[PDB]
RNA sequence: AAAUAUGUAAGAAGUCCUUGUUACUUAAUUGAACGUGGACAUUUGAAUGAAGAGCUUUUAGUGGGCCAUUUUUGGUAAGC
RNA sequence: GGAAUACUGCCAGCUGGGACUGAGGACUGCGACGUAAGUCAAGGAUGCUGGCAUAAUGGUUAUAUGCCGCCCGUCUUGAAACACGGACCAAGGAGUCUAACGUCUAUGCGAGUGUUUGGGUGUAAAACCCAUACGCGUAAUGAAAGUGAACGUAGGUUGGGGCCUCGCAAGAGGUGCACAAUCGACCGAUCCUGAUGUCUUCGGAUGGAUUUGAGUAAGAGCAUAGCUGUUGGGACCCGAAAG
RNA sequence: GAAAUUGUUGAAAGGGAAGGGCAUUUGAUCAGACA
């Protein structure tokens, strides 16, 4: 008789998608990016700034 | 398209599976990498007006 | 016959209310309400009277005394939404902690025992005001809005 | 606003009760309504719908069609069910013994049946003997053979029995029906 | 017989294990989505380092919301709009971007807004306005049981299972997507961002292919 | 009955269902069959072709009784025999003692054939018969006898 | 020689195999048409959508039109 | 070289204020939390407090204030129209009935159907009962003289609801009424063929066919009644100039 | 003993017509429950 919206009513967030808890626990909405460090070839950044 | 549709239907049911017998429409391009080596981009500006008549 | 006959009659029986699932929880009073805080009343006979907040009762109300020798305000209750908290507070130990609660107000022209519990918690707190200059006079005076006071910008 | 694509509030357009106020017939449908709901046997469904049908779609089925039905290989012993009425037929002599069920039964249809050892049961009788409609053979009278039907679709070149009240020469046979008088249909 | 204290636990074990099946599944997706986005990030970084340019795969899924009412529409766009289940101002259907639909878009471009929906909004869309079609009847989802009762045949048992079929345009995208009712969207909460809607997006308008911006527009209408 | 009739429902509607533009006038097409060859031609040449002109030859003072020959078919020959005598004549398919039925005294003038008989042979005395119907009652043993 | 519009096709009413019928056909069991039996269902043979499709009877009013964009003829033009 | 920040985006991160809503009425469902009992915000509002039980509240009415609102009926592409009718009220005032018809539905009976011209009879225009015929139907088709409906299990093919059998089942088979398409057969019209025969001109077997028919091919009608539609009638009502 | 229309009495309104719609104020008026 009344569609209850998930994204509010966190209870019904759990009736469907139980993995909702794991996401919140591991935060996982702000998963930190494993740093890497490759850098662009000169040709790339040379055409970029090119007139 | 059918005489060669059964010709597929034999070897694709002898040697294995995955018929894929109906056609499908053109598909959006898949990822690809294009090199600047030997093809370093040419930069382009629009043209001023002239008459040449 | 004047209306022949209504072939059906609604069943006079009363069918049971549905099993509700709305259970309680205590108020999360706003931070501004912490006991020993001076308050401005906006309603009742005691509109405007500045007052002292003492303890949050279990029917959501608040407990205040003027006190009586200051600005005539007995031990009474005020609703948590008809009052403002200010940025000035007083002390709370060195005065009674648990004497008063709801049924004290349910009565059954003055009443003489009441006059006593007044003075009881009165003087243990009239001690605290004298410690700060210009404070009984502040609490004795009522509260009013002067011309050009804009309450959305006025801090308390 | 909605760009509708089917026409709103359309009635399904099939009967859901006979236009009859026959108290017995309304009762007959009170039964098969229940049979069609709680048994999900096809025979019950195909019989509830046929109770609504107007006279023009419960055309008679004659003892002679029946007897020829009971000559399909596998039928001879079948409680045979006609949701219209059933009509005698003096053009057949041999008539097999059978138990047949129908709405109304004409005088001469009983004579050919009970005095061939057959049975003539109403349709609620046939319900108890075949609740799920087991071992039945539904027979239907010829619909597009009434008099009105030879007039439908009338038109040039469709050759379809004009609507006429007096037949014979001098009546709608001269011009546009032979080439000596103009043309033909 | 009794069969009363002989049944209950049989159902729940079939159930309680079904939910642990889902929870296994959604985590697979969670890694699947995040591995895939992180991989296209690094591919661009690699190609830039190589001296090459990584070019992403043309999107295979768009979201189309009809932004124009129902009167004064020529007969050919009027039909297409119906074939996409877009028959009422502010309603949405997904579409697999193929040629045979690329051309359907070109024909209705003056009347719809569309672009490339993010995972974030397919989630909110289906979580909020998701409704499926069971004998007509516009049924609200509200329980993966309803989804399994109509998509279990295809390997879709949960709601996030669906969302996966959509954005991955799985091999059963059609009957999954046709299961979904057209999303009855409201008008945008912050407005349209423009004086006049019925100019193309490139011209300071609102209709047509606005690519990744289709997500700002939809969440406000959502 | 009047109450069941649409004119009670049209009360309060100005045109009464007969139209504002074209109205319900007196005789917009001509009375009767008027115009059949002119402006109702289509509705006749179609729904009534052959309406115009003469086809036959005429018969002054044609009296219909002159041609009274009601037709009877082998398909129903045994209906002229009462049931109490159908019970015992159905057996005993005897060439001697055949059932003789006088169709003219029953009300017919010609016996045509269309629908097969049992081989119980019968004497039938009629005015006229079709070649085949005799050619099949003589195939059941019986004989057609002629009367007037 | 465009664009826009337009005919047809996208399978079980299918593809093929050994061979039966006739007065038509061929020099010819040659062919023609119609068949018994036999051999092949995920992706049944593009996309999208289907408050479901096919079909019948009867009968109303109507048979003065007008406007806008674009194409357009007569007219200098026109709320022609 | 190493940082910060903007922009953009995600978060099933946390959280403050305002507004409208409370439909449903024992229980059944999906969940969450729990070690269990059980508890929950999980298939729609409950709790505490206070005023009112008369004048809270609301209805009606007149007025006033805000914004809004041309005169209805009619023909018309277009009427508020400088188009027509209409000063006001009462009462009256227009698709009727009948003959014969189409379709549809209800009903009776059913290869039949129709008692009511007439007769009988009566508690007297009712009701009730009946003989013979007569109408339509059961046969068509030719201008007519005429002839007059089974090669077949009343046929073949394709489709077919239901029923039967095999199968836990998906399905497979068998039979298949109504209905539809098609190819045959049958009767009449037509045009050919023209045997046994014979009152030499009579008789017309047999076999046919880019021809034809309001046909047969295991009958469906007849009667009453209703709505609607049809034609003749004053014919929806009022209206000529004329004869 | 209706209506049109009219006299008297009473209430009310009225800056080149009057009447109507939604909403509310004022006035007038009708309403509202049992240990
Ligand atoms: Mg609406
Ligand atoms: Mg409408
Ligand atoms: Mg002539
Ligand atoms: Mg706003
Ligand atoms: Mg604007
Ligand atoms: Mg109307
Ligand atoms: Mg009409
Ligand atoms: Mg008129
Ligand atoms: Mg007219
Ligand atoms: Mg006209
Ligand atoms: Mg029909
Ligand atoms: Mg019509
Ligand atoms: Mg007409
Ligand atoms: Mg018409
Ligand atoms: Mg326009
Ligand atoms: Mg940010
Ligand atoms: Mg957030
Ligand atoms: Mg105005
Ligand atoms: Mg005019
Ligand atoms: Mg007007
Ligand atoms: Mg004017
Ligand atoms: Mg005039
Ligand atoms: Mg006048
Ligand atoms: Mg009157
Ligand atoms: Mg007759
Ligand atoms: Mg008149
Ligand atoms: Mg005169
Ligand atoms: Mg004259
Ligand atoms: Mg008097
Ligand atoms: Mg008066
Ligand atoms: Mg005055
Ligand atoms: Mg003046």
PDB file of C-alpha atoms (C1' of nucleotides) in Angstrom, chain E residues 76 83-85 100-101 133 136 174 178, chain G residues 4-6 46-52:
ATOM      1  CA  UNK E  76       6.860   9.701 -37.644  1.00  0.00           C
ATOM      2  CA  UNK E  83       8.030   2.490 -29.703  1.00  0.00           C
ATOM      3  CA  UNK E  84      10.379   3.685 -26.951  1.00  0.00           C
ATOM      4  CA  UNK E  85       7.505   3.788 -24.417  1.00  0.00           C
ATOM      5  CA  UNK E 100      19.015   0.275 -35.532  1.00  0.00           C
ATOM      6  CA  UNK E 101      18.489   2.470 -32.443  1.00  0.00           C
ATOM      7  CA  UNK E 133       5.410  -4.849 -15.840  1.00  0.00           C
ATOM      8  CA  UNK E 136       0.245  -4.611 -17.471  1.00  0.00           C
ATOM      9  CA  UNK E 174      15.989  -6.485 -23.903  1.00  0.00           C
ATOM     10  CA  UNK E 178      11.293  -4.141 -21.312  1.00  0.00           C
TER      11      UNK E 178
ATOM     12  C1'   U G   4      12.776  13.437 -48.340  1.00  0.00           C
ATOM     13  C1'   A G   5       9.112   9.955 -49.758  1.00  0.00           C
ATOM     14  C1'   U G   6       8.497   4.572 -52.136  1.00  0.00           C
ATOM     15  C1'   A G  46      18.085  -8.343 -37.499  1.00  0.00           C
ATOM     16  C1'   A G  47      16.166  -3.835 -34.144  1.00  0.00           C
ATOM     17  C1'   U G  48      11.957  -1.743 -31.060  1.00  0.00           C
ATOM     18  C1'   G G  49       7.001  -2.118 -28.993  1.00  0.00           C
ATOM     19  C1'   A G  50       2.549  -4.632 -28.179  1.00  0.00           C
ATOM     20  C1'   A G  51      -4.137  -2.554 -21.741  1.00  0.00           C
ATOM     21  C1'   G G  52      -3.492  -9.300 -27.267  1.00  0.00           C
TER      22        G G  52
END
